[PDB]
Motif scaffolding. Structure first.
Motif, PDB file in Angstrom:
ATOM      1  N   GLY A 187      -2.267 -52.844  22.738  1.00 29.06           N
ATOM      2  CA  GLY A 187      -1.977 -53.462  24.024  1.00 29.06           C
ATOM      3  C   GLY A 187      -1.895 -54.970  23.937  1.00 29.06           C
ATOM      4  N   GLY A 188      -1.537 -55.505  22.777  1.00 24.42           N
ATOM      5  CA  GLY A 188      -1.355 -56.937  22.602  1.00 24.42           C
ATOM      6  C   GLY A 188      -2.491 -57.641  21.878  1.00 24.42           C
ATOM      7  N   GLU A 189      -3.620 -56.986  21.701  1.00 24.80           N
ATOM      8  CA  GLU A 189      -4.861 -57.658  21.288  1.00 24.80           C
ATOM      9  C   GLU A 189      -5.382 -57.023  20.027  1.00 24.80           C
ATOM     10  N   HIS A 190      -5.983 -57.830  19.145  1.00 22.45           N
ATOM     11  CA  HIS A 190      -6.575 -57.277  17.928  1.00 22.45           C
ATOM     12  C   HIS A 190      -7.588 -56.178  18.227  1.00 22.45           C
ATOM     13  N   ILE A 191      -7.569 -55.136  17.399  1.00 21.23           N
ATOM     14  CA  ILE A 191      -8.606 -54.131  17.445  1.00 21.23           C
ATOM     15  C   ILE A 191      -9.744 -54.644  16.558  1.00 21.23           C
ATOM     16  N   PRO A 192     -10.911 -54.049  16.617  1.00 23.49           N
ATOM     17  CA  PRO A 192     -12.003 -54.494  15.739  1.00 23.49           C
ATOM     18  C   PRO A 192     -11.584 -54.441  14.270  1.00 23.49           C
ATOM     19  N   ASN A 193     -11.943 -55.477  13.527  1.00 16.58           N
ATOM     20  CA  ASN A 193     -11.734 -55.620  12.090  1.00 16.58           C
ATOM     21  C   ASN A 193     -10.310 -56.067  11.793  1.00 16.58           C
ATOM     22  N   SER A 194      -9.443 -56.188  12.808  1.00 15.12           N
ATOM     23  CA  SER A 194      -8.156 -56.804  12.623  1.00 15.12           C
ATOM     24  C   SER A 194      -8.287 -58.299  12.793  1.00 15.12           C
ATOM     25  N   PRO A 195      -7.588 -59.076  11.966  1.00 19.16           N
ATOM     26  CA  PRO A 195      -6.678 -58.638  10.903  1.00 19.16           C
ATOM     27  C   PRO A 195      -7.357 -58.373   9.568  1.00 19.16           C
ATOM     28  N   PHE A 196      -6.809 -57.429   8.809  1.00 15.72           N
ATOM     29  CA  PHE A 196      -7.292 -57.122   7.488  1.00 15.72           C
ATOM     30  C   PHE A 196      -6.564 -58.047   6.500  1.00 15.72           C
ATOM     31  N   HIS A 197      -7.316 -58.891   5.809  1.00 12.13           N
ATOM     32  CA  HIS A 197      -6.809 -59.689   4.710  1.00 12.13           C
ATOM     33  C   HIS A 197      -7.014 -58.963   3.395  1.00 12.13           C
ATOM     34  N   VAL A 198      -5.936 -58.796   2.619  1.00  9.92           N
ATOM     35  CA  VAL A 198      -6.013 -58.057   1.368  1.00  9.92           C
ATOM     36  C   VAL A 198      -5.125 -58.717   0.335  1.00  9.92           C
ATOM     37  N   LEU A 199      -5.455 -58.446  -0.930  1.00 10.30           N
ATOM     38  CA  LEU A 199      -4.709 -58.914  -2.087  1.00 10.30           C
ATOM     39  C   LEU A 199      -4.236 -57.703  -2.877  1.00 10.30           C
ATOM     40  N   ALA A 200      -2.920 -57.558  -3.040  1.00  7.26           N
ATOM     41  CA  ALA A 200      -2.340 -56.441  -3.789  1.00  7.26           C
ATOM     42  C   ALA A 200      -2.156 -56.793  -5.255  1.00  7.26           C
ATOM     43  N   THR A 201      -2.715 -55.950  -6.156  1.00  4.22           N
ATOM     44  CA  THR A 201      -2.728 -56.194  -7.598  1.00  4.22           C
ATOM     45  C   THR A 201      -2.290 -54.952  -8.369  1.00  4.22           C
ATOM     46  N   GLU A 202      -1.833 -55.167  -9.606  1.00  2.00           N
ATOM     47  CA  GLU A 202      -1.406 -54.066 -10.477  1.00  2.00           C
ATOM     48  C   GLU A 202      -2.482 -52.984 -10.531  1.00  2.00           C
TER      49      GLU A 202
END
Lengths: 202, 202
Positions: A187-202
């Motif tokens: 509904g326009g607003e972050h849910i709990p724990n959003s945003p998820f910051h992640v690093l993608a690796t091999e």
């Protein structure tokens, strides 16, 4: 033939002056039937000041259907030009309004069939799908949106499966190494724990 | 047929009441040559009151070598009996001291070939190994340890593999259904998000 952008008219839900519901896809109409021949352009800045995709459908009749997804609450600034000239009442200032309580959403994450609860990363693997399930049962009648900020700086509207029981499923696979921001809104607003910051690796 | 526990002598680094370093294994020696015939017992209570395994090697000559792992900071209570009778100066109260900064440790979880980031639990499958890798490169000179509280009511030291590049691998398989607590410490202190509460299921 020439064009006359002052004759172009705009209307429809996506320009509603009283505001539009955040999280819901919306359309509006541009009517250039009296405006001559020119290209229609639509540029949208979202409430964080970033560009947002505007899909333009030429109806072959002097009118155009323009659609966008207001994933986040706030002001969308929509600049509309015809034949290179800005049309009357552009830029439009459209207020995407939140409803419900995003904070009542519950999120469970799964990788490879392993449930992580409400947890993701920091590291994820390129090519490995993540499944994020959001339980919006208690949050209101609006939708969950998922927007991914990739390491090259693009913004992606990730498809969100609406199961129609108040739950939503997000399937996302990182294809390139680097930093991602996975933003999940209700509904326009972050849910709990959003945003998820992640690093993608091999 | 008799014994005299008062003639048993005890000494060595694991009885150093001035203090020992948490996270490092330690040993001590029991000399019962003058004490007659009896079974030697060593009970260890960690600083929270939980039993810890003491490994007793009977050297076949009236002496014994005992080892234990002081994984957590604080006072260990070491009760030593010969023939069921407490030896002099038992119980020994041995303070394990912390060093380093456990907050600088970083956790990676892997199950079934899938990297799960820092995400352990809420649920795991009985008989499926979990690999928990702790990056302690920035935490200092001591070691990572792992203890598991089993639905048994038992408290197990889990062997931790030291890779000697600052990281440590914990391998653990839950053999039985129920609630498990997985405690991971560095230099005596909980790393972030320890203790980990997980439920093992079929």
């Amino acid at each position: 033939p020439a064009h006359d952008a002052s004759k172009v008219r705009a209307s429809g839900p996506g320009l509603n002056a009283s505001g539009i519901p955040a999280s819901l896809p919306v359309e509006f109409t541009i009517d250039a039937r009296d405006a001559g021949e020119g290209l229609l352009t639509v540029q949208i800045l979202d409430p964080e000041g970033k560009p947002k995709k505007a899909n333009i459908r030429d109806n072959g009749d002097g009118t155009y259907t323009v659609s966008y997804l207001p994933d986040m609450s706030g002001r969308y600034t929509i600049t509309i030009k015809y034949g290179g000239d800005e049309i009357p009442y552009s830029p439009f200032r459209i207020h995407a309004l939140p409803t419900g309580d995003a904070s009542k959403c519950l999120v469970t994450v799964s990788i490879g069939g392993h449930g992580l609860g409400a947890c993701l990363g920091p590291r994820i693997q390129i090519g490995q799908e993540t499944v994020i399930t959001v339980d919006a049962k208690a949050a209101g009648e609006r939708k969950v949106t998922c927007t991914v900020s990739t390491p090259d700086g693009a913004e992606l509207d990730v498809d969100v499966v609406e199961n129609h029981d108040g739950t939503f499923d997000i399937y996302y696979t990182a294809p390139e190494p680097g930093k991602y921001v996975i933003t999940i809104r209700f509904g326009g607003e972050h849910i709990p724990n959003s945003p998820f910051h992640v690093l993608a690796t091999e």
